[PDB]
Structure 1
Amino acid sequence: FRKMAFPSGKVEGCMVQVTCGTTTLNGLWLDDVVYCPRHVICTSEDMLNPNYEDLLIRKSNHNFLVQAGNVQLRVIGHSMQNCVLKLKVDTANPKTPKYKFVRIQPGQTFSVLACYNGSPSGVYQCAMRPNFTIKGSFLNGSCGSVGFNIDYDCVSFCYMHHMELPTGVHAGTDLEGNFYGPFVDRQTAQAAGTDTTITVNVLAWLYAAVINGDRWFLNRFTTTLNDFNLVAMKYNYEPLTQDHVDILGPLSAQTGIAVLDMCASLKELLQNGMNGRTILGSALLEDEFTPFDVVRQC
């Protein structure tokens, strides 16, 4: 089983480079506006304690060198929405796809077009962790790269990359500029909270392995909902809510295995390990597959 990213074409055409001062990073070009992280304007001296309203009011339109591959791009206006700098530009992007700006919730999956200096470098599928971070591959220069789902024509932009956190993990905002998590585009001592496993996702990953013909982890047991949580907590798993149960109903009725019976297997797998075995090619319990993802690609 393969983690599958979305075909990045519609995003590729919106990736531009944005420069301010000595700083350069990526921006997102939709419809005569260019979205980018607001720290493009800090001197990294300003990073310890930046007054953004003060640094921005000291900037002219001409202070923003914006390039889209070959051609410059005139900035005729500039404003700030929460942590995102919104750059009015001379020309509307003709490759603007159909889009929306979505704020996802932790556990949900999306794809990331990692870029450098406005050049797309690669694409990958990841997940927002319960502690509001993204475990990803970002060299210095990924700032501004975006996270999205594509649905029919419609790119659902849900994430823009801002910061690396000491843990090695990545913090960003939605495309409105509100951070995911207790993180601030500033140089504090913010550490990521304690990560947890997305219990609802590993369960859905377990149905897929049965659907693709693996039954060896099941058993004869079942478990109350409360009993299952009190056990999984001990392994740093996210509580399983009645909402999480309902979400799984589809995948249950397709396989014939009740959702709490399936939790009975997760309990056994957590107590035993896999005894040398694997599941869809992993020796780990995979939490970056959501119920939606499993229904689509199985």
Structure 2
Amino acid sequence: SGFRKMAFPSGKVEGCMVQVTCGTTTLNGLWLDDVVYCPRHVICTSEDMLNPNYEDLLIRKSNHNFLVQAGNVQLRVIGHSMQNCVLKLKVDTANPKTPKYKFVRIQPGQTFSVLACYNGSPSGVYQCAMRPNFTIKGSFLNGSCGSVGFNIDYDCVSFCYMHHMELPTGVHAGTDLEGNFYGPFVDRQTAQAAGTDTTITVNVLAWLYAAVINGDRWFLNRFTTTLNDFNLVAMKYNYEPLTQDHVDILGPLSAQTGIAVLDMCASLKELLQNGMNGRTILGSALLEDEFTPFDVVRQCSGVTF
């Protein structure tokens, strides 16, 4: 039994993090095959970060102005392009540790493991979620730029996130590996406000389902509710509106626990209206929304990659 916030084994991604240096700036890069991906803000000075013209800055930069180092090995850059907000550096050697990879753009509410790095070496790995405002609440210090988020499909590492900037609010924003920012965020040191962050209701229901599987059953009520009426309560407490698609995704969990979705949604309504009265669910005095329904069935059924 037991239920903890798990992250995918970072081994396959460790053999792909390299160090990227342009002038004075040094951040982490992703070396897949013969290409190195890194945030394009590596090409700016400290003054340019206010209003940077990246296309003009890249024009002045040649191949010999970029330094790629995988551990203690300098890779010779042969071509530099700029796909959206990602700098693509064509190196000479194909990474012999490139796994079966795939570039995906995750939807809000999905979770992914982050391998935080500095100067090309991994420091730690944690599991975070894509907030509905297209931000993430992670731990990144200076030099963490270029740290990648990923999911592992048994053998295929699905790269989905690359850290770019910490918003002044303390949250973090990034792009997919194609360069497109997750959200309305541009790469410049300017007052950028995120949207209103809701609570992933479907993920909370999966977390409540995980609690029933792992012992905790105090929140289970004798009541039930309908979909629209529960959404009227979810709107009050800034919770994501629930759809029939979410009910069917929670289908596998509902069958294993013998508790219908609308009956679990009723137990959630009481927790939103009456609080928790100082109790705890799976060691948490607050409702958790960083576990997708697929993350629960991974830990509650047992699969390996």
Q: TM-score range by the shorter chain?
A: over 0.9
Taking only the aligned residue pairs, the percentage that are identical comes to 100
Alpha-carbon offset, residue 191 of structure 1: 1.1
Structural RMSD (CA): 0.9
CA distance in 2, matches of 1:15, 1:230: 46
Match of 1:250, SS? helix
Alpha-carbon offset, residue 214 of structure 1: 2.2
CA distance in 2, matches of 1:188, 1:276: 41
- 1:54-76 CA distance string (max 9 Å, x none): 11111111010111111111001
- 1:167-198 CA distance string (max 9 Å, x none): 10000000110000000011221111121111
- 1:108-128 CA distance string (max 9 Å, x none): 011000000111111111101
Alignment of 1:229-248 (within 5 A): 229-248=231-250
- 1:204-227 CA distance string (max 9 Å, x none): 000111111222111121111111
- 1:202-260 CA distance string (max 9 Å, x none): 00000111111222111121111111011111111111122111111111112111111
Which one is further off, 253-262 or 19-28? 253-262
- Alignment gaps of 5+ in structure 2: 301-305
Q: Please name the residue that 1:197 is paired with.
A: 199
CA distance in 1, matches of 2:46, 2:227: 49
CA distance in 2, matches of 1:153, 1:246: 27
CA distance in 1, matches of 2:254, 2:154: 27
Q: TM-score, normalised by structure 1?
A: 0.98
CA distance in 2, matches of 1:78, 1:173: 19
Alpha-carbon offset, residue 31 of structure 1: 0.4
Which one is further off, 210-219 or 23-32? 210-219
Match of 2:210, SS? helix
Aligned length: 298
**2:299 is the counterpart of 1:293:** no
Q: TM-score, normalised by structure 2?
A: 0.96
CA distance in 2, matches of 1:185, 1:261: 45
Which one is further off, 86-95 or 275-284? 275-284
CA distance in 1, matches of 2:190, 2:68: 29
Q: Please name the residue that 1:141 is paired with.
A: 143
CA distance in 2, matches of 1:30, 1:42: 24
CA distance in 1, matches of 2:233, 2:154: 40
Runs of 4+ in 1 over 4 A off after TM superposition: none
CA distance in 2, matches of 1:130, 1:28: 26
Alpha-carbon offset, residue 4 of structure 1: 0.5
Alpha-carbon offset, residue 53 of structure 1: 1.1
CA distance in 2, matches of 1:80, 1:130: 28
Match of 1:297, SS? helix
CA distance in 2, matches of 1:296, 1:66: 37
CA distance in 2, matches of 1:21, 1:230: 54
Match of 2:250, SS? helix
- 1:111-169 CA distance string (max 9 Å, x none): 00000011111111110101111101101110000000111111000000000001100
CA distance in 1, matches of 2:154, 2:241: 33
Match of 1:115, SS? strand
CA distance in 2, matches of 1:262, 1:285: 14
